Amino acid sequence: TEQLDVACGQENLPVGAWPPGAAPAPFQYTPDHVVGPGADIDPTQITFPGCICVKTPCLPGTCSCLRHGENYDDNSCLRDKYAEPVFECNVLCRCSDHCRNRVVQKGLQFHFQVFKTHKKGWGLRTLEFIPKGRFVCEYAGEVLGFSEVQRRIHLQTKSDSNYIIAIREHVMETFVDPTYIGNIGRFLNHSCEPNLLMIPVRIDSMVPKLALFAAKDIVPEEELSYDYSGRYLNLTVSASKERLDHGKLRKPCYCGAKSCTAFLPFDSS
Ligand SMILES: Nc1ncnc2c1ncn2[C@@H]1O[C@H](CSCC[C@H](N)C(=O)O)[C@@H](O)[C@H]1O
Ligand SMILES: [Zn+2]
Ligand SMILES: [Zn+2]
Ligand SMILES: [Zn+2]
Numbered sequence: 290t291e292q293l294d295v296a297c298g299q300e301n302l303p304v305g306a307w308p309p310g311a312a313p314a315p316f317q318y319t320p321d322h323v324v325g326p327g328a329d330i331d332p333t334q335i336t337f338p339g340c341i342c343v344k345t346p347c348l349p350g351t352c353s354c355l356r357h358g359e360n361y362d363d364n365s366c367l368r369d370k371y372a373e374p375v376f377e378c379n380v381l382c383r384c385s386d387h388c389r390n391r392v393v394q395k396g397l398q399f400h401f402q403v404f405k406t407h408k409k410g411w412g413l414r415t416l417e418f419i420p421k422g423r424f425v426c427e428y429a430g431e432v433l434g435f436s437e438v439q440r441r442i443h444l445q446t447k448s449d450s451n452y453i454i455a456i457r458e459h460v461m462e463t464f465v466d467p468t469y470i471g472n473i474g475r476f477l478n479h480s481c482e483p484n485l486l487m488i489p490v491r492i493d494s495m496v497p498k499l500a501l502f503a504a505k506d507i508v509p510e511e512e513l514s515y516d517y518s519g520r521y522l523n524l525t526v527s528a529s530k531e532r533l534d535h536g537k538l539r540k541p542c543y544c545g546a547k548s549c550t551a552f553l554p555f556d557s558s
């Protein structure tokens with residue numbers, strides 16, 4: 290039995306695996322964050338009451354979800370010292386599901402493929418063109434507390450892929466770990482010159498979605514990457530987004546970028 294869809298039917302579109310007859314190490318798929326040990330906020334619970342727009346579209350000035358201008362353009366592309374927080378209209382907003390401020394919530398819109406890279410283990414690539422600015426995928430998994438993070442990191446062995454990420458927004462802190470239960474974003478490799486940008490996007494919950502948007506046009510078969518240090522295009526003091534690992538060895542980076550630093554920029558413990 291060859292597993293056709295790495296996402297197990299749980300996303301809008303299947304995600305294939307390559308090469309034929311090869312599959313990544315098993316994990317439990319989830320399209321969305323789930324509660325993990327130490328989480329104090331259930332990421333599935335509604336926290337935000339939404340906007341009051343019902344008679345006319347949600348627009349800046351009148352939509353309490355759009356207090357910092359439109360997040361997205363009409364093609365659903367992300368527009369664009371302190372960073373403006375992004376809120377989508379949510380399950381409680383009475384605007385229609387066509388509202389231009391509903392984008393991450395709509396889910397995957399491209400066909401991706403988990404594939405064996407030359408030196409980085411499995412990665413994720415697109416099988417189709419993705420326009421600059423378009424939502425690509427979340428990085429979703431168990432939402433953990435700080436001590437649980439510490440507990441898991443300290444067990445990371447030498448060949449372990451490291452997946453926990455720490456999001457700090459200035460402090461709101463969110464730890465997401467798709468190691469055991471996670472979505473397809475867990476397969477994104479790091480690049481020193483990546484093609485995705487991660488933005489914390491709030492929808493129903495105070496626990497943000499870690500939404501990756503295309504930072505440039507991405508062509509078919511192009512591998513999808515983001516910066517594990519979270520520095521790429523991160524030009525405010527407001528939001529650090531750091532992948533964590535254990536141990537003092539600096540792991541080599543094989544991203545191939547001209548500005549490669551030669552090391553994978555985990556925050557080590
Ligand atoms: N630019 C890069 N250079 C070398 N290894 C990388 C890399 N980006 C990601 N990795 C590898 O991928 C791990 C992060 S999880 C990313 C998916 C992973 N390659 C997998 O097969 O499941 C890293 O710990 C490292 O093993
Ligand atoms: Zn509104
Ligand atoms: Zn709204
Ligand atoms: Zn709306």
Ligand SMILES: [Zn+2]
Nearest residue numbers: 481542544549
């Ligand atoms: Zn690199």
